[PDB]
């Protein structure tokens, strides 16, 4: 099995990668959860973006 990303779980996993609000801890957690499973890429996104929306400066 050959697990190179489909466009789809690339574009998630650089987003997460660069999202500027999250915590190191939040990014991490939210990377290990695709490098688990890249399935989940869609809902993982939506959370980091929700959380780094909320952590915006002001
Ligand atoms: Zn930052
Ligand atoms: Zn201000």
Same mark, same amino acid.
């Given at each position: 099995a050959d697990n190179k990303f489909n466009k789809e779980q690339q574009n998630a996993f650089y987003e997460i990668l660069h %999202?500027?609000? %999250?915590?190191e801890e939040q990014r991490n957690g939210f990377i290990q959860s695709l490098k688990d499973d890249p399935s989940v890429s869609k809902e993982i996104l939506a959370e980091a973006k929700k959380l780094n929306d909320a952590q915006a400066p002001k």
């Open positions: %999202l500027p609000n %999250l915590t």
